[PDB]
Write a protein that binds this ligand. Structure first.
Ligand SMILES: *C(=O)/C=C/c1ccc(O)cc1
Length: 124
């Protein structure tokens, strides 16, 4: 798939993409429910972070997979967006739990489908 990171209509392009389609993207893509449980997780994300995209589905991103994100700067933004029903924020961050610290750019954006939120990730 040819979709740019940060593209304005990304939620429309990715909407209802199956797991296989998402694996064609040139950046990491995670879909979370409103509680932070992982619904989808693509190959590019697993290459960035080391996690196995097959095993993380169903785990809680903030409580277990990615505790380094449970701060106001990441999780706090996420839950504000869930509470309001509108989320569109892009910021750099470092992923450092049980891994070499890895600097990324994160884009969180509400998905079109119900109770769904995208977390997009690229290397910086
Ligand atoms: C901090 O604990 C970050 C961890 C992490 C970020 C993103 C992922 O896809 C997996 C783990």
């Amino acid at each position: 798939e040819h979709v740019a990171f940060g593209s304005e209509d990304i939620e429309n392009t990715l909407a209802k993409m199956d797991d296989g389609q998402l694996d064609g993207l040139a950046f990491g893509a995670i879909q979370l429910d409103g509680d932070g449980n992982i619904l989808q997780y693509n190959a590019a994300e697993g290459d960035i972070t080391g996690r196995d995209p097959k095993q993380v589905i169903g785990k809680n991103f903030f409580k277990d997979v990615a505790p380094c994100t449970d701060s106001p700067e990441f999780y706090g933004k996420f839950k504000e967006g869930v509470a309001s029903g509108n989320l569109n924020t892009m910021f750099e961050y470092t992923f450092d739990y049980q891994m070499t610290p890895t600097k990324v750019k994160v884009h969180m954006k509400k998905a079109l489908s119900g109770d769904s939120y995208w977390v997009f990730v690229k290397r910086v």
